[PDB]
Motif scaffolding. Structure first.
Motif, PDB file in Angstrom:
ATOM      1  N   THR B 141     -36.341  22.532  -4.259  1.00 25.66           N
ATOM      2  CA  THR B 141     -36.192  20.969  -4.146  1.00 25.66           C
ATOM      3  C   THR B 141     -36.494  20.640  -2.549  1.00 25.66           C
ATOM      4  O   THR B 141     -36.346  19.411  -2.320  1.00 25.66           O
ATOM      5  CB  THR B 141     -35.479  19.958  -4.823  1.00 25.66           C
ATOM      6  OG1 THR B 141     -34.029  20.569  -4.557  1.00 25.66           O
ATOM      7  CG2 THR B 141     -35.636  20.217  -6.322  1.00 25.66           C
ATOM      8  N   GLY B 142     -35.843  21.402  -1.960  1.00 18.44           N
ATOM      9  CA  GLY B 142     -35.443  21.167  -0.297  1.00 18.44           C
ATOM     10  C   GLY B 142     -36.490  21.080   0.527  1.00 18.44           C
ATOM     11  O   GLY B 142     -37.736  21.279   0.465  1.00 18.44           O
ATOM     12  N   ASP B 143     -36.172  21.209   1.871  1.00 18.52           N
ATOM     13  CA  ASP B 143     -36.809  21.302   3.157  1.00 18.52           C
ATOM     14  C   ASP B 143     -38.062  22.493   3.166  1.00 18.52           C
ATOM     15  O   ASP B 143     -38.943  22.246   3.853  1.00 18.52           O
ATOM     16  CB  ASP B 143     -36.187  21.416   4.404  1.00 18.52           C
ATOM     17  CG  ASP B 143     -35.604  20.124   4.868  1.00 18.52           C
ATOM     18  OD1 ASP B 143     -35.764  19.051   4.128  1.00 18.52           O
ATOM     19  OD2 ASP B 143     -34.782  19.953   5.780  1.00 18.52           O
ATOM     20  N   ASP B 144     -37.617  23.496   2.409  1.00 14.99           N
ATOM     21  CA  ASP B 144     -38.279  24.810   2.549  1.00 14.99           C
ATOM     22  C   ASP B 144     -39.251  24.882   1.256  1.00 14.99           C
ATOM     23  O   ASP B 144     -39.662  25.821   1.178  1.00 14.99           O
ATOM     24  CB  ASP B 144     -37.283  25.983   2.599  1.00 14.99           C
ATOM     25  CG  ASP B 144     -36.250  25.983   1.617  1.00 14.99           C
ATOM     26  OD1 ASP B 144     -35.867  24.949   0.779  1.00 14.99           O
ATOM     27  OD2 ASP B 144     -35.404  26.955   1.528  1.00 14.99           O
ATOM     28  N   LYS B 145     -39.168  23.915   0.404  1.00 16.41           N
ATOM     29  CA  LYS B 145     -40.169  24.137  -0.712  1.00 16.41           C
ATOM     30  C   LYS B 145     -41.534  24.566  -0.536  1.00 16.41           C
ATOM     31  O   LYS B 145     -42.102  25.424  -0.984  1.00 16.41           O
ATOM     32  CB  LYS B 145     -39.765  22.737  -1.546  1.00 16.41           C
ATOM     33  CG  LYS B 145     -40.794  22.876  -2.857  1.00 16.41           C
ATOM     34  CD  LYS B 145     -40.721  21.419  -3.728  1.00 16.41           C
ATOM     35  CE  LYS B 145     -41.536  21.393  -4.763  1.00 16.41           C
ATOM     36  NZ  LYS B 145     -41.550  22.403  -5.903  1.00 16.41           N
ATOM     37  N   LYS B 146     -42.097  23.883   0.496  1.00 18.54           N
ATOM     38  CA  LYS B 146     -43.534  24.233   0.804  1.00 18.54           C
ATOM     39  C   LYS B 146     -43.559  25.502   1.115  1.00 18.54           C
ATOM     40  O   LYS B 146     -44.718  26.420   0.919  1.00 18.54           O
ATOM     41  CB  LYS B 146     -44.006  23.080   1.654  1.00 18.54           C
ATOM     42  CG  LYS B 146     -44.434  21.757   0.797  1.00 18.54           C
ATOM     43  CD  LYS B 146     -45.028  20.794   1.769  1.00 18.54           C
ATOM     44  CE  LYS B 146     -45.308  19.434   1.135  1.00 18.54           C
ATOM     45  NZ  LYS B 146     -45.406  18.316   2.150  1.00 18.54           N
ATOM     46  N   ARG B 147     -42.567  26.013   2.033  1.00 16.21           N
ATOM     47  CA  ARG B 147     -42.886  27.385   2.703  1.00 16.21           C
ATOM     48  C   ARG B 147     -42.390  28.314   1.604  1.00 16.21           C
ATOM     49  O   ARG B 147     -43.126  29.756   1.607  1.00 16.21           O
ATOM     50  CB  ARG B 147     -41.669  27.685   3.614  1.00 16.21           C
ATOM     51  CG  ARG B 147     -42.473  26.984   5.114  1.00 16.21           C
ATOM     52  CD  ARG B 147     -41.394  27.332   6.431  1.00 16.21           C
ATOM     53  NE  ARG B 147     -40.255  26.393   6.209  1.00 16.21           N
ATOM     54  CZ  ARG B 147     -40.198  24.870   7.002  1.00 16.21           C
ATOM     55  NH1 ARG B 147     -41.339  24.815   7.480  1.00 16.21           N
ATOM     56  NH2 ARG B 147     -39.187  24.260   6.533  1.00 16.21           N
ATOM     57  N   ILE B 148     -41.502  28.056   0.649  1.00 19.61           N
ATOM     58  CA  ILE B 148     -41.363  29.175  -0.559  1.00 19.61           C
ATOM     59  C   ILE B 148     -42.587  29.112  -1.350  1.00 19.61           C
ATOM     60  O   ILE B 148     -43.259  30.278  -1.535  1.00 19.61           O
ATOM     61  CB  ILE B 148     -40.258  28.669  -1.643  1.00 19.61           C
ATOM     62  CG1 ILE B 148     -38.862  28.606  -0.731  1.00 19.61           C
ATOM     63  CG2 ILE B 148     -40.325  29.324  -2.841  1.00 19.61           C
ATOM     64  CD1 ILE B 148     -37.842  27.962  -1.454  1.00 19.61           C
ATOM     65  N   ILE B 149     -43.592  28.054  -1.680  1.00 20.24           N
ATOM     66  CA  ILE B 149     -44.808  27.984  -2.501  1.00 20.24           C
ATOM     67  C   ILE B 149     -45.887  28.712  -1.475  1.00 20.24           C
ATOM     68  O   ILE B 149     -46.412  29.743  -2.207  1.00 20.24           O
ATOM     69  CB  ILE B 149     -45.251  26.674  -2.704  1.00 20.24           C
ATOM     70  CG1 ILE B 149     -44.372  26.025  -3.615  1.00 20.24           C
ATOM     71  CG2 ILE B 149     -46.694  26.613  -2.979  1.00 20.24           C
ATOM     72  CD1 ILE B 149     -44.729  24.447  -3.731  1.00 20.24           C
ATOM     73  N   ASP B 150     -45.673  28.666  -0.351  1.00 15.65           N
ATOM     74  CA  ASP B 150     -46.835  29.341   0.514  1.00 15.65           C
ATOM     75  C   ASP B 150     -46.232  30.887   0.662  1.00 15.65           C
ATOM     76  O   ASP B 150     -47.404  31.687   0.958  1.00 15.65           O
ATOM     77  CB  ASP B 150     -47.041  28.856   2.127  1.00 15.65           C
ATOM     78  CG  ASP B 150     -48.178  29.032   2.686  1.00 15.65           C
ATOM     79  OD1 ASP B 150     -49.284  28.750   2.183  1.00 15.65           O
ATOM     80  OD2 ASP B 150     -48.404  29.700   3.477  1.00 15.65           O
ATOM     81  N   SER B 151     -45.256  31.132   0.556  1.00 19.57           N
ATOM     82  CA  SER B 151     -44.733  32.630   0.578  1.00 19.57           C
ATOM     83  C   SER B 151     -45.316  33.302  -0.821  1.00 19.57           C
ATOM     84  O   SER B 151     -45.597  34.344  -0.579  1.00 19.57           O
ATOM     85  CB  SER B 151     -43.417  33.055   0.576  1.00 19.57           C
ATOM     86  OG  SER B 151     -42.894  32.525   2.068  1.00 19.57           O
ATOM     87  N   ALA B 152     -45.065  32.721  -1.792  1.00 15.04           N
ATOM     88  CA  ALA B 152     -45.736  33.321  -3.317  1.00 15.04           C
ATOM     89  C   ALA B 152     -47.224  33.187  -2.956  1.00 15.04           C
ATOM     90  O   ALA B 152     -47.851  34.396  -3.026  1.00 15.04           O
ATOM     91  CB  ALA B 152     -45.457  32.194  -4.155  1.00 15.04           C
ATOM     92  N   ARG B 153     -47.917  32.086  -2.442  1.00  5.95           N
ATOM     93  CA  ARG B 153     -49.350  32.353  -2.204  1.00  5.95           C
ATOM     94  C   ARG B 153     -49.913  33.364  -1.297  1.00  5.95           C
ATOM     95  O   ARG B 153     -50.779  34.002  -1.706  1.00  5.95           O
ATOM     96  CB  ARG B 153     -49.927  30.743  -1.589  1.00  5.95           C
ATOM     97  CG  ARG B 153     -51.421  30.932  -1.563  1.00  5.95           C
ATOM     98  CD  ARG B 153     -51.977  29.790  -0.262  1.00  5.95           C
ATOM     99  NE  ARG B 153     -51.183  30.275   0.977  1.00  5.95           N
ATOM    100  CZ  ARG B 153     -51.572  31.318   1.689  1.00  5.95           C
ATOM    101  NH1 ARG B 153     -52.476  31.909   1.311  1.00  5.95           N
ATOM    102  NH2 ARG B 153     -50.753  31.508   2.854  1.00  5.95           N
ATOM    103  N   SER B 154     -49.148  33.535  -0.279  1.00  5.12           N
ATOM    104  CA  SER B 154     -49.483  34.645   1.049  1.00  5.12           C
ATOM    105  C   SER B 154     -49.590  35.817   0.284  1.00  5.12           C
ATOM    106  O   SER B 154     -50.410  36.730   0.260  1.00  5.12           O
ATOM    107  CB  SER B 154     -48.907  34.299   1.912  1.00  5.12           C
ATOM    108  OG  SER B 154     -48.904  35.462   3.031  1.00  5.12           O
TER     109      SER B 154
END
Ligand SMILES: COc1ccc(C[C@@H](C)CN)c2cc(C(=N)N)sc12
Ligand SMILES: COc1ccc(C[C@@H](C)CN)c2cc(C(=N)N)sc12
Ligand SMILES: *SCCNC(=O)C(C)(C)Oc1ccc(Cl)cc1
Ligand SMILES: *SCCNC(=O)C(C)(C)Oc1ccc(Cl)cc1
Ligand SMILES: [Mg+2]
Ligand SMILES: [Mg+2]
Ligand SMILES: [Mg+2]
Ligand SMILES: [Mg+2]
Lengths: 6, 236, 236, 6
Positions: B141-154
């Motif tokens: 839920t935090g500032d890094d949520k989009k980066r976590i999603i993008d790490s999975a995607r990548s």
């Protein structure tokens, strides 16, 4: 439903 | 490392025993110790690692969902205030889940992926990396949520690129990767159309390659194909 | 005590949440913390304590049995020597099981039993004491095995004596105590005739008292009666 | 069979 993953 | 004094072969043997006893936390601890010996893993050893952590984190995810549902209902209009306890306990389970994900991602980064050169190993580990970032994304839920999603995607995308170049369309690892990346699209990335397209194309391309397989390989591939079909049925 | 800083009521609330999430180790830890507050437990709180530890130790017992079976087969004539690992891992699980039993027995001795004056509490705790000594007896092999068996017997016997004087024959705690003491006779004490006699007499005396009960009490009592009948069917 | 306990 909760989808299938492996 | 508490497994540092145990032989690699003994750790693998005990992981197999732990699996038979349905002691998946022990299984995961033994396999972590085996990975930490520094040698590459065989196909079977990769399966043992994945089965152990999949079962541990799967139980944590199921518990987190129960608690998150209770927490959501506790916050609806008309609900009686019952204090911080539901949130606290959901957070406790969440932190333990994140710790397991961090442990698996740590094993992959130090140093399984960098030594994995064959498609069967590299795709498998990159799929795992996508999976454990996906589990982090489920609770993020935090500032890094989009980066976590993008790490999975990548991670999934690198695995997909290798799998399409180096594996036949019926390879069970290729199929399971596609199954899981499709679920990522549907549940995490808010992309149901991509999820459906990926599952359908994967299924159809596997169907067309089944004729090349032995009876045993056919059984393996069709099992995962059925999961793709099951998800498509859920989603359409 | 890691739960020392948490309110009693919060520990009970979280035990209930942990049960809903099927997180029985957490449930047991919360209930241990609640017991350690020093206050007596209510009927429901006693159930939460018992459910939590029954599930934890039940899983350990099931795993121990799997491993002990593998160990037995590894020691038969013709089996390939595979090293100390099966014994070691069985011993690891066994030691964890013994630790849980020791923890429960410790809570009962410090100080649940000594403050339990009503039959519904005292019989329940003495039954638990018999149960956890019985689980220790299942794995025991040393100089103290007979004393462990006798500790189980003694606790069950005190519970039985109180239950027969102070509870009706249909009381579910009285019935469950008899069910479990009968299993003790059959599996631990090598006394199948006593096991069968106890189950039969318990069943028949409960049957004759069902007429006094409400519909809901009847449902509760007949459920445990059916377990007595199930065991009798297994044994005859 | 493994007998019932509660
Ligand atoms: C290469 O290692 C494996 C291959 C294939 C399988 C199972 C087949 C039926 C395909 N799903 C399997 C199960 C393992 C385990 N749970 N220890 S390892 C392992
Ligand atoms: C007094 O507390 C109880 C009474 C009765 C029951 C269940 C009835 C159906 C009888 N078996 C029960 C279940 C509990 C739990 N699992 N938290 S507490 C509790
Ligand atoms: S690796 C464990 C053995 N394989 C399996 O249990 C199933 C789920 C049947 O097959 C797959 C597991 C993992 C992948 Cl990536 C693909 C298939
Ligand atoms: S105490 C937990 C609630 N009761 C139960 O789950 C069952 C097993 C149905 O009943 C009994 C549990 C424990 C005893 Cl001693 C007797 C009945
Ligand atoms: Mg958090
Ligand atoms: Mg594409
Ligand atoms: Mg021992
Ligand atoms: Mg008698």
């Amino acid at each position: 439903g909760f989808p299938a993953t492996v | 490392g508490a497994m540092g004094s145990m032989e690699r072969a003994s750790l693998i043997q005990k992981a197999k025993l732990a699996e038979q006893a349905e002691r998946y936390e022990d299984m995961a601890a033994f396999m972590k110790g085996a990975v930490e010996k520094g040698e590459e893993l065989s196909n079977e050893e990769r399966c043992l690692l994945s089965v152990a952590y999949k079962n541990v984190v799967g139980g944590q995810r199921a518990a987190w969902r129960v608690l998150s549902s209770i927490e959501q209902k506790s916050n609806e209009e008309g609900s009686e205030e019952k204090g911080p306890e539901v949130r606290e306990y959901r957070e406790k389970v969440e932190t333990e889940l994140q710790g397991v994900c961090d442990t698996v991602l740590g094993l992959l980064d130090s140093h399984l992926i960098k030594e994995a050169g064959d498609a069967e190993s590299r795709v498998f580990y990159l799929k795992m990396k996508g999976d454990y970032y996906r589990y982090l994304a489920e609770v993020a839920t935090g500032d890094d949520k989009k980066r976590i999603i993008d790490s999975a995607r990548s991670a999934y995308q690198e695995a997909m690129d290798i799998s399409k170049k180096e594996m036949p369309p019926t390879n069970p690892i290729r199929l399971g990767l596609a199954l899981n990346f499709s679920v990522f699209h549907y549940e995490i990335a808010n992309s149901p159309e991509e999820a459906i397209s990926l599952a359908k194309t994967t299924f159809d391309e596997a169907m067309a390659d089944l004729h090349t397989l032995s009876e045993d390989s056919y059984k393996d591939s069709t099992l995962i194909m059925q999961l793709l079909r099951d998800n498509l049925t859920l989603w359409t």
